[PDB]
Amino acid sequence: DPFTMTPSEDFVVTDRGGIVENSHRVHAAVVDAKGRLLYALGNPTRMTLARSAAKPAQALAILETEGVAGYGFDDADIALMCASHSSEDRHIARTRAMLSKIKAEEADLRCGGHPSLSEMVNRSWIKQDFIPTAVCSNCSGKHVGMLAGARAIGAGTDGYHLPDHPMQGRVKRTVAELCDLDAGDVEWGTDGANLPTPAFPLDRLGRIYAKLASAADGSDAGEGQSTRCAALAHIFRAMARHPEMVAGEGRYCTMLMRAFDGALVGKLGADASYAIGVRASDATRQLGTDGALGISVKIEDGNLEMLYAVVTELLERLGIGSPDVRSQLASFHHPQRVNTMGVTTGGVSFPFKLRGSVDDPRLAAVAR
Amino acid sequence: TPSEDFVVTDRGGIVENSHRVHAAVVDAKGRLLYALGNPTRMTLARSAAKPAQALAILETEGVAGYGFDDADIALMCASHSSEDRHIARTRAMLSKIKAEEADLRCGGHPSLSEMVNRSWIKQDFIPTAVCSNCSGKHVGMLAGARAIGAGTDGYHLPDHPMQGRVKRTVAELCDLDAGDVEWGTDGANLPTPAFPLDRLGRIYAKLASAADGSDAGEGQSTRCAALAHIFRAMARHPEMVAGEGRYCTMLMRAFDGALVGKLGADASYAIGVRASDATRQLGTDGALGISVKIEDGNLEMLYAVVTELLERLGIGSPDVRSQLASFHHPQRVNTMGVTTGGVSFPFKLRG
């Protein structure tokens, strides 16, 4: 029944010859630069672990640490602070170069190695029986930045990753401020790189990225900016200018940001969250706002392949990009379902319904 | 109305992911005894259908003369890890029917075992037909095609008499009309069935009930004798059904003949349990079947949920189920060795 559809029915579905295989619940928030909710799927205020999608906020805490500017980190270094990189040789090399800029060593890192986020890098490692180390961590740029901040303020570098260290105090305050939340409304766990990692309502992730894009708009327009806005604009520019540092070859975040050529930044969070900050455009004005826009997405069950398909579908429904721009992402939008003998067996579909654009006022949209 | 039954992962007590669970526990006639979620969800059984496909093979006139043994039949029932021993038995079965790898109509794929696949990657190995996790099923279907003098070139096609026999056998074991079983195509390019989840449990209840009847000396039909043989082969050679470290293998070794279990791709699972003190305590005088589907397809959550279900149902002892402890509560340890989270089962079995 099309007239009683509900957020609880916002799904992405795979089929085999039209027979339902798996279904996945979708949550999404589309917000303006003040965080006002414009469109939604599912529960747009779902309490959600932002995971690596919080990295631009952590990079802001690093860059706002007094004395860090003296080290001379460049745009590509800042993009690596914002990264879940593929541990390609260039990412490892830049990690070592950043360590040298602050006169630190690999032994000072408090993150550990892991199989590469890229299948192609991991195959190269498997062939050589290579055991990844701390400098290979996908979070290595963030950790070097945290070490840099600890050094700059005269804190111990031992324990820079611990919650009671001033660098983590700065991270926690900065995240809550960008979300416009009280501290008690942000919850904290520990991530794979052994750092505090925040959870907050999903729409506030979109809000962080709308603020990134809004700051970039203000910088480009030559507006006088606060130190924080200037730093957010710098983070946006660094990500857009060096998207290969943010992920790597063949990675969604990199291909997305290259396709859009400065129009937006995007960032993956582990267990299938995603965030995009969109500079003001004809597309954002058609969506009903006079400034920048933020988008955040969570697949409830954590499936990454479905995440990238949904994010690409959502950009199409929001009219962001062109068919030609979004077509660089076609392999993510409709994932291949080809069996071992080259026969297509099924596909992906998107039975979810954006709300916010309509319906009988008696139709309740219960966030679920 | 189906309950809202979930398995939930957390990071420091904060919800990470949640996964909807469907499950059916049925008696030997398929009557529903316990459920999670929607126990009749229309579900692609995928490889959990392989014992029914093995039955169609074993019931084919002339197949007995090839001399397939228990380990061969276990391989027909397998989603194996493509270990060297699985490939070697595939080749040995091809030799029994005087066929070649080129006669197979399945293709190679990365191993279901990450350890095997890493070993292949290190050695630049390109898997071929004989490495398919379904290779034993395909040899069996080739064997059946040969046995009745049908063409072998298209034994995998829907209009071939081997697939006619498979389709009829699946619906008969489900106790469904032909029109109530839907069909797609699987990764190995064979027809693969969808039917209500509880009927998958019914198939495995019939497997275990047949083993109970053969064990007790009852006048069994030929079909029941064949089902008992399939159960015996899987429980005797569980390493052929999956492989080292695989859930199905560790599950069946732990239970030492008390049950058989089988994975279906995209996170279905089926178990047939022979009558026991545990099944009698559950209120049935015969064998039992269990089938599970994780709605979003997550395998790690599947194995955690199945093990939690065995615990709720009292199936096995604590000591026996502790062999599956690593699947029941999967590791959540970061790159520096710190535990960051866990898994929870806020569902409740309804009876």
Numbering used by the authors:
A (entry chain A): -3 to 353, 357 to 367
B (entry chain B): 2 to 352
Task: Copy out sentences from the published article reporting this entry, exactly as the authors wrote them.
Asparaginases (EC 3.5.1.1), which split L-asparagine to L-aspartate and ammonia, are grouped into three unrelated structural classes: Class 1 (bacterial-type), Class 2 (plant-type), and Class 3 (Rhizobium etli-type). ReAV is a homodimer with an α/β protomeric fold, formed by two tightly packed domains. The active site of the enzyme is located in a cleft on the protomer surface and marked by a zinc ion with an unusual coordination sphere created by Cys135, Lys138, Cys189, and a water molecule. The conspicuous catalytic center of the enzyme comprises two Ser-Lys tandems (Ser48-Lys51 and Ser80-Lys263), centered around the curiously hydrated Ser48 residue and located in the close vicinity of the metal binding site.
